Amino acid sequence: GSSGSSGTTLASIGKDIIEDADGIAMPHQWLEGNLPVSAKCTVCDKTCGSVLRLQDWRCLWCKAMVHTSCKESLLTKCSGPSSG
Ligand SMILES: [Zn+2]
Numbered sequence: 001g002s003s004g005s006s007g008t009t010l011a012s013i014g015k016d017i018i019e020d021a022d023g024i025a026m027p028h029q030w031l032e033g034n035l036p037v038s039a040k041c042t043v044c045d046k047t048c049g050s051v052l053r054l055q056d057w058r059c060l061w062c063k064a065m066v067h068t069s070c071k072e073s074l075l076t077k078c079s080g081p082s083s084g
């Protein structure tokens, strides 16, 4: 006859810094509509501007206007709302 058992461990986690130390990648903040009168697509280079449609999307950080379809087409990454 011989037996035994024991073990007690605990841990508390939840918040984790989603920032790196090499070159964090920041997406583009697409804002439905809100396009200027002289708007322009940065993917296809076509006349844009949703006067009474408020559809066209445009980044607020890099300030890049793109179409709904062209959006997915865009590959380049964003820099951010501010760095220096
Ligand atoms: Zn952007």
Ligand SMILES: [Zn+2]
Pocket (backbone or CB within 6 Å): 041, 042, 043, 044, 045, 046, 066, 067, 070
């Ligand atoms: Zn476009």
